Design a protein around this ligand. Structure first.
Ligand SMILES: [Zn+2]
Lengths: 50, 50, 150, 470, 94
């Protein structure tokens, strides 16, 4: 949502354009087997300990 | 070079304008072909086998 | 030199040399344009910095290569090499006429001998094999010998 | 203190100069005007300066060169030029004859009409250089004649310059002062030849430049003063505005050139802006110079920062694709197909491939691959260029094949076959020439070959060679 | 006997500071431009980090512009773009 506040507050907006869902990137999904496929290949992310 | 010039002259072999880039079976390994895939660039005409 | 996908690859020395050359030329021009002192000084300083980065980088601000974070490898690093201290004649070198594989027992052996895999011995002595082959006359020419063992 | 990085060195070294007061801008620009126009007047007072313009325009109407090289504009068309120039020639021919206390009025005007001409930078510089070179000759003879008295023949410089100034051509100072019965007088009899032979060129320059040595020095000297004033004022102006250059260069930061590089080329830009500016137009110098600096910056950037230089317009044309690539990014789902962009552009639509290919900057040959070791990518680039040994073996043998097989042919068959080709001989010889060296030419020679081949066609002479073709 | 002139066996490597002239010795030309290759025809831009004129021909025994492509013409410097025609190996040396 993009709001443009009318200058000289109280804060209220001249126009707020609420854009529909904007696609930013796709994200990897996890298999029922707990694996990810990057390129045609099952991959695993090892849990980190710190 | 002159040796191959004479050689090609005698045996009438037109030297091809093309070199063999074919994907050969790795030396020493032997098996059965189970599956074949063809990924064609979008816009390039699909060949026969494709 | 070229590469697959039409892309190129090149040493960092080209980036460095390029910088040094460009700045040097800019200095010559600024000399001919009678630029004010502050400018010619700044330029000279920059050139010194560049020449330094070329000879040995890291005694200075540590210049980075084009569109890459990793600091460009200077000439000093070209000499010094890495992996501790060796330059190419110590740590190792790749060598022709060689091979390797898993080892087995062979109790039938005599202390002066070892079992050598057939294919291995073929590939290893390939040059000698060619020679003997066309030495006796079993092969017309070296090409034909190659085709024979092939 | 100095943190060693040249960025701060320059940053502080420049911050030592105060911002120009709005009055000071006009004051400095005024100083500039004074200086320049002074050197211009100094040019106009040189006779050869006018004569050269005439001698060149003679070549212009003679089709021996174009007008665009000799001038750009007057103060203000080939006909208008063809007349206006004749005006210059007129004022020259009038000023030229009065050289007989009257002339002092007209030689003023010759300069004016010469000032009406806006010359080409190359030409103007050629003139200036010519003047100072002439002065270097004048100095050659002056120092030559000077060192033959004080340094060699031992005369005081006090008495030397006494009668020397005001003539330096005639013998009033020389022949009349050798007989003076002074100590340094009778010493001059030995070098009297050399000096007197040297006076020749000295009187000659006066005929060339059309001035007395006296005047000759004065004119271009005053010019030098003017130029000095100009460069001084200009430099003051440039030094004043460096902050602006920095401010602009900060925008172009990661475009592939270092901060200092950007501010430097931009600084050159500011220099140019100080060169071409007129305060009389009332244009704010700040906003005017901003364009010039941003210009030099962009130009330099796109011109150099690539390992593979690309022509100017090309980069722009690439950016134009990088533009429409974004609008269709999330709007199109994934992104516009590689072939759907340039429809939005005006062009054959094929350009996308080539442009998108050559563009991408080469990968550092030192880019470390896996294992983190010294296994850097460059160590993996194989040499295809060098021939494999197994080849040179076969070539070494093919030498023997062709030689052995050429041993079996007749004398003239071997000679003709080796000659027709380049076999073990420099280059080769045209089939017309092969007979020229055999005394027997044309079809005959061309027959012996065609038969020779036949002999080498069948499985006796044709055997050893047959295997060589796989 | 005369000592020697050119390549023979060698011993005793020496190392020392370089002189401007001693540097101008190993140099067969001055690189005046940051340019590398033509961007279209990948041939080297003359007087650049990669140059055939200063350093060496791209392909063996073949001049850049191609006036002399024959193994016959070897010790010849080309008229058009001076590149003497010699093994591309000398591009690793000069
Ligand atoms: Zn050539």
């Amino acid at each position: 949502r993009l709001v443009i506040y009318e200058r000289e507050a109280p804060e209220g907006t001249v126009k707020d354009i609420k854009e529909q869902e904007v696609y930013m990137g796709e994200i990897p999904l996890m298999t029922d087997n707990g694996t990810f496929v990057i390129n045609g290949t099952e991959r695993v992310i090892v849990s980190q300990l710190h | 070079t002159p040796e191959e010039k004479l050689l090609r002259a005698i045996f009438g072999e037109k030297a091809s304008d093309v070199k063999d880039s074919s994907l050969r079976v790795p030396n020493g390994v032997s098996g059965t072909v189970i599956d074949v895939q063809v990924f064609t660039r979008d816009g390039v005409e699909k060949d026969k086998r494709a | 030199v070229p590469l697959d996908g039409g892309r190129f690859a090149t040493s960092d020395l080209n980036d460095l040399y390029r910088r040094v050359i460009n700045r040097n030329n800019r200095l010559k021009r600024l000399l001919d344009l009678a630029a004010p002192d502050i400018i010619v000084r700044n330029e000279k300083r920059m050139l010194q910095e560049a020449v330094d980065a070329l000879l040995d980088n890291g005694r200075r601000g540590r210049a980075i290569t084009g569109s890459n974070k990793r600091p460009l490898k200077s000439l000093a690093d070209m000499i010094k090499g890495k992996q501790g201290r060796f330059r190419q004649n110590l740590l190792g070198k790749r060598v022709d006429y060689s091979g390797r594989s898993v080892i087995t027992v062979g109790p039938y052996l005599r202390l002066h001998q070892c079992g050598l895999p057939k294919k291995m011995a073929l590939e290893l002595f390939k040059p000698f094999i060619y020679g003997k082959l066309e030495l006796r006359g079993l092969a017309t020419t070296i090409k034909a010998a190659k085709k024979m063992v092939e | 203190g100095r943190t060693t990085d040249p960025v701060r060195m320059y940053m502080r070294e420049m911050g030592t100069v105060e911002l120009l007061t709005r009055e000071g801008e006009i004051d400095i620009a005024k100083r500039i005007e004074d200086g320049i126009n002074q050197v211009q007047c100094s040019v106009a007072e040189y006779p050869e300066a006018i004569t050269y313009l005439l001698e060149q325009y003679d070549r212009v109407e003679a089709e021996e060169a174009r007008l665009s090289d000799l001038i750009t504009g007057f103060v203000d068309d080939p006909e208008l030029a063809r007349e206006k120039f004749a005006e210059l020639r007129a004022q020259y021919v009038v000023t030229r004859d009065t050289i007989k206390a009257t002339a002092q009025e007209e030689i003023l005007k010759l300069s004016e009409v010469f000032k009406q001409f806006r010359l080409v930078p190359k030409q103007f510089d050629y003139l200036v250089n010519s003047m100072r070179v002439m002065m270097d000759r004048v100095r050659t003879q002056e120092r030559l004649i000077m060192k033959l008295c004080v340094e060699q023949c031992k005369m005081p410089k006090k008495n030397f310059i006494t009668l020397f100034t005001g003539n330096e051509t005639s013998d009033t100072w020389f022949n009349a002062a050798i007989a003076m019965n002074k100590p340094w007088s009778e010493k001059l009899h030995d070098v009297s030849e050399e000096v007197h032979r040297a006076l020749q060129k000295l009187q000659q320059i006066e005929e060339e430049t059309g001035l007395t040595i006296e005047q000759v020095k004065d004119i271009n000297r005053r010019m030098s003063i003017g130029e000095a004033k100009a460069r001084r004022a200009k430099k003051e102006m440039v030094e004043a505005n460096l902050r602006l250059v920095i401010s602009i260069a900060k925008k172009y930061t990661n475009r592939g050139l270092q901060f200092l590089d950007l501010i430097q080329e931009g600084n050159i830009g500011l220099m140019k802006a100080v060169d071409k500016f007129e305060y009389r137009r009332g244009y704010k110098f700040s906003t005017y110079a901003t364009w010039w600096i941003r210009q030099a910056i962009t130009r330099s950037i796109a011109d150099q920062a690539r390992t593979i230089r690309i022509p100017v317009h090309m980069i722009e044309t690439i950016n134009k694709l990088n533009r429409i690539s974004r609008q269709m990014l999330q709007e199109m789902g994934r992104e516009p197909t590689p072939e759907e962009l340039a429809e939005r552009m005006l062009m054959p639509e094929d350009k996308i491939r080539k442009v998108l290919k050559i563009a991408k900057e080469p990968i550092s040959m030192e880019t470390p691959i896996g294992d983190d070791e010294d296994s850097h990518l460059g160590d993996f680039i194989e040499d295809t260029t060098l021939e494999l040994p197994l080849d040179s073996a076969t070539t070494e043998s093919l030498r023997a094949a062709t030689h052995d097989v050429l041993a079996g042919l007749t004398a003239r068959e071997a000679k003709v076959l080796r000659m027709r080709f380049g076999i073990d001989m420099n280059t080769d010889y045209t089939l017309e020439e092969v007979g020229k060296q055999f005394d027997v030419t044309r079809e005959r020679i061309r027959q012996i070959e065609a038969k020779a081949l036949r002999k080498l066609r069948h499985p006796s002479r044709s055997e050893v060679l047959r295997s060589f073709l796989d | 006997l005369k000592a020697q002139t050119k390549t023979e066996e060698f011993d005793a490597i020496k190392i020392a500071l370089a002189s401007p002239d001693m540097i101008r010795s190993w140099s067969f030309g001055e690189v005046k431009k940051p340019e590398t290759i033509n961007y279209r025809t990948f041939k080297p831009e003359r007087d650049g980090l990669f140059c055939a004129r200063i350093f060496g021909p791209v392909k063996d025994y073949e001049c850049l512009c191609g006036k002399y492509k024959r193994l016959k013409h070897r010790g010849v410097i080309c008229e058009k773009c001076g590149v003497e025609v010699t093994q591309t190996k000398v591009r690793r040396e000069r």
